[PDB]
Amino acid sequence: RLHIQNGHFVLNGQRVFLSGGNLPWMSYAYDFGDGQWQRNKNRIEPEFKKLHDAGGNSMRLWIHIQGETTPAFNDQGFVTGPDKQGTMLDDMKDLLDTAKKYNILVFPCLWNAAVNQDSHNRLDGLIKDQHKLQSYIDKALKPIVNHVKGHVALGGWDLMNEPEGMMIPDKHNAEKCYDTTALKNSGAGWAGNKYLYQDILRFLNWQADAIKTTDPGALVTMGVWNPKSNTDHFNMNNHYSDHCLRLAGGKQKGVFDFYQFHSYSWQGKWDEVAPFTHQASDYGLHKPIVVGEFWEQDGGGMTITQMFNYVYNHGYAGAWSWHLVQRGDNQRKGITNIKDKTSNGKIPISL
Numbered sequence: 564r565l566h567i568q569n570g571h572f573v574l575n576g577q578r579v580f581l582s583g584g585n586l587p588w589m590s591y592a593y594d595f596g597d598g599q600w601q602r603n604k605n606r607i608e609p610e611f612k613k614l615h616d617a618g619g620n621s622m623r624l625w626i627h628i629q630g631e632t633t634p635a636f637n638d639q640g641f642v643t644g645p646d647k648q649g650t651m652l653d654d655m656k657d658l659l660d661t662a663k664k665y666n667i668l669v670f671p672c673l674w675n676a677a678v679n680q681d682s683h684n685r686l687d688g689l690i691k692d693q694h695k696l697q698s699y700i701d702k703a704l705k706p707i708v709n710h711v712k713g714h715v716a717l718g719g720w721d722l723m724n725e726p727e728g729m730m731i732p733d734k735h736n737a738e739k740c741y742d743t744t745a746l747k748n749s750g751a752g753w754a755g756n757k758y759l760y761q762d763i764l765r766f767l768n769w770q771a772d773a774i775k776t777t778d779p780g781a782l783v784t785m786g787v788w789n790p791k792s793n794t795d796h797f798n799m800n801n802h803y804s805d806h807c808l809r810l811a812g813g814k815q816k817g818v819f820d821f822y823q824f825h826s827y828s829w830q831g832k833w834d835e836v837a838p839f840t841h842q843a844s845d846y847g848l849h850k851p852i853v854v855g856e857f858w859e860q861d862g863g864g865m866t867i868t869q870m871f872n873y874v875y876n877h878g879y880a881g882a883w884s885w886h887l888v889q890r891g892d893n894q895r896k897g898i899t900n901i902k903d904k905t906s907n908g909k910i911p912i913s914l
Contacts, residue, residue, distance in 0.1 A: 564780060565668060565718050572851055572880055572908065574668075574726055579894040580908030581609040581668065581718070581853055581881030582871070582901060583614055583621030584894055594624070596646030599632065600654035610887055615665035617895035618902025620912045622716060623670040623786075623855060623883050629678075630685035634703035640688035645707055652710040659716040663914045668697065668718030670883075673770070673785065675703075677725040690758060690766050700773045712778040715914045716889055719782035721823065721855075722770050727788045729757040740764065740807035745800040749791050760802055761811050767803075768812025775816040776865035782820040786855050788822045790836055794846040797836045801848070821880065824847060825856035839863060839870065843878030846902035851880030858885040859893060871897035875907055 565574050572579050588594055589603040589610075600607075607624075614622060627633050633651055635643045645651035655671075662669045674686060680685050688695040711717060720772065733747035741760040743751070771783045785803065787793045795801045805818040826838040834839045839862070844853045854874045859867040874882035882901075884894040903911050 564713065564715050565782060566780070567782070568848070570851070574823070574912055579620070579907040579912060580875060580904070580910055581621040581899055582910050583619035583667070584623070584624055584884040584887040584898070585856060586624035586887055587608060587885070588625050589888065590630075592625070592628035595626055595658070596633035596651035597648040597697065598650050600650065600657060603735070604657070604661070610891070611662055611665040611667050611898070612707065613891060613895065614887065614898070617898045618910060619851045619898045620910055621668050621670065621881060621883060622887075623672055623721065623850050625675060625724065627673050627760040628675045629681045631682065634699060636685050640683070640685055640692070640695055642695070642702045645703045650712045652706065655707055655711050655907060656714070659711055659714045663716040666912050666914050667716065668912070668914075669716055670718045670721050670784070672721035674723040674725050674776060675725070675729040676723060677754060677788070679729060679757070687757075690762050693765070696766060696769060700769060704770060704773050704891035705777050708777040708781065713780060717781065717876060719784055719820065720774055722767050722783065722785045724786050725788040725825065726763050726767075726785070727751040727792050727835050728754040728759075730763065730792075731756040731759060734759065736760070738800060738810070739800060740804075740810055742800065743800060746791060749789065751788070751792065764802070764808055764811030766819035768808040768814050770817070771819065772812070772814035772817030784819050784821050784823045784853070786823040786825055789834070790826070790838060793805055793822055793824065794836070794848065796847045799836065818908065819850065821851040821853060823853045826854060827857065827861035829861070831863065833863045837863075838877075838879065839873055841877070843880070853883065855878050855881070855883045856885045857882070858890060867893050867897040868900045871898070871901045875901050875904055878907070880908070
């Protein structure tokens, strides 16, 4: 299974570069549980085949999102189980079995904060209320993780897409881990200035620890909207260090194994911290860094092929383009172009 050795991803005795894309869903938030996987499988499986045929080895795809269909919540906002109809565990295993057929490592992304659509404040309650969060962990997360424990096609668990969509920016805190003054006018909070960092860091710490207690060999990450929240360089503050997660939540193994940056140009221009104008070492971090979302339409003038090559050539650990379902025609060209590169990790894998 995928692991990190001497600071780099390794699979089957070889340093590996993670190349692929974000599905990112078939039916948004309606792909898993309550019979939904078997209904969508005939459309999702061909995406795995196309990705493999193009030379990709990695797929990120989104699971609960904001709790639209999984996990199952009661009317008070506590979690009752992975779903209602009892397909979720089978669905997650079948997802991974399907990926294995195509030699694709899967990175399920549990939650999303890039939009503010949380019907019945279900995600909100998990972030704010420790008892509700514990119910998610005990009734849904641990059963899911246990059911697919050790699966060779599981690349890693991404706890949350873009927490920064709803983090309150420009907020002083005496504790550096919680202070968001460096994020003033960064764009963080676009979906609504809603959360404080102690709450989100507890949310992340507890889930990461639960995963690595249940499946100690699993890897855990989280996808930041922009590395501005994830580096102490560039006049920024890294909120997601081991120290910060442990401080907020207290659970020793609740840390990330690798970091994941998203990077998009704005109005055609890369910002001052952009991964696409820097190199991995510029961030002052000590874990692999995957560039986990990007696309040509917000690529600062680069072609998608230039983008995949850029990531590979600048010390990053992986490259996942955004929205294969809609943009795969173009993005597969970049995936194909880099598939035979070996100097920063080999791409073809066998599961």
